[PDB]
Design a protein around this motif. Structure first.
Motif, PDB file in Angstrom:
ATOM      1  N   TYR A  69       0.869  -1.170   0.000  1.00 50.69           N
ATOM      2  CA  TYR A  69       0.000   0.000   0.000  1.00 50.69           C
ATOM      3  C   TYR A  69       0.908   1.222   0.000  1.00 50.69           C
ATOM      4  CZ  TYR A  69      -3.747  -3.226   1.287  1.00 50.69           C
ATOM      5  OH  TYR A  69      -4.647  -4.266   1.315  1.00 50.69           O
ATOM      6  N   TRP A 127     -12.692   0.756  -1.255  1.00 50.56           N
ATOM      7  CA  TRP A 127     -12.806   0.659  -2.708  1.00 50.56           C
ATOM      8  C   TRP A 127     -12.434  -0.733  -3.196  1.00 50.56           C
ATOM      9  CZ3 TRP A 127     -15.439   2.861  -6.262  1.00 50.56           C
ATOM     10  CH2 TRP A 127     -15.075   2.782  -7.613  1.00 50.56           C
ATOM     11  N   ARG A 128     -11.382  -1.315  -2.631  1.00 45.01           N
ATOM     12  CA  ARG A 128     -11.006  -2.680  -2.959  1.00 45.01           C
ATOM     13  C   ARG A 128     -11.913  -3.666  -2.232  1.00 45.01           C
ATOM     14  NH1 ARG A 128      -8.174  -4.286   1.729  1.00 45.01           N
ATOM     15  NH2 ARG A 128      -7.160  -2.515   2.772  1.00 45.01           N
ATOM     16  N   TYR A 150     -10.843  -7.147  -1.877  1.00 49.81           N
ATOM     17  CA  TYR A 150      -9.939  -8.090  -1.167  1.00 49.81           C
ATOM     18  C   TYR A 150      -9.326  -7.438   0.063  1.00 49.81           C
ATOM     19  CZ  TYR A 150      -7.312  -5.865  -5.054  1.00 49.81           C
ATOM     20  OH  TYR A 150      -6.824  -4.992  -5.982  1.00 49.81           O
TER      21      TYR A 150
END
Lengths: 49, 42
Positions: free
Chosen positions: A19, A40-41, A43
């Motif tokens: 990240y 937003w992701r 996973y």
């Protein structure tokens, strides 16, 4: 940004996630709450940090 | 308290280099030590 570090799918399917530019006392840790989508992701993982 | 590097919020970030300043300094120190102690032979 999210960067995915892989040794290659010929070798292994394990990945490491970078990240970019954020601290990880600040990364969203919704690991078992990923279906509620606060991110937003989709996973989310809880491996070694 | 307002920094000019708050261009992150508009999506503009800076990636850090692979070699740090210490590693570049160690490469330079190795070059200097080789040049002083061995000439062009290294």
């Amino acid at each position: 940004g999210v960067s995915v570090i892989t040794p290659g799918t010929n070798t292994s399917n394990q990945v490491a996630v970078l990240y970019q530019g954020v601290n990880c006392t600040e990364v969203p840790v919704a690991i078992h709450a990923d279906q509620l989508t606060p991110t937003w992701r989709v996973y989310s993982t809880g491996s070694n940090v | 308290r307002d920094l000019i590097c708050a261009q992150k919020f508009k999506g503009l970030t800076v990636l850090p280099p692979l070699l740090t300043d210490e590693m570049i300094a160690q490469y330079t120190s190795a070059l200097l030590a080789g040049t002083i102690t061995s000439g062009w032979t290294f």
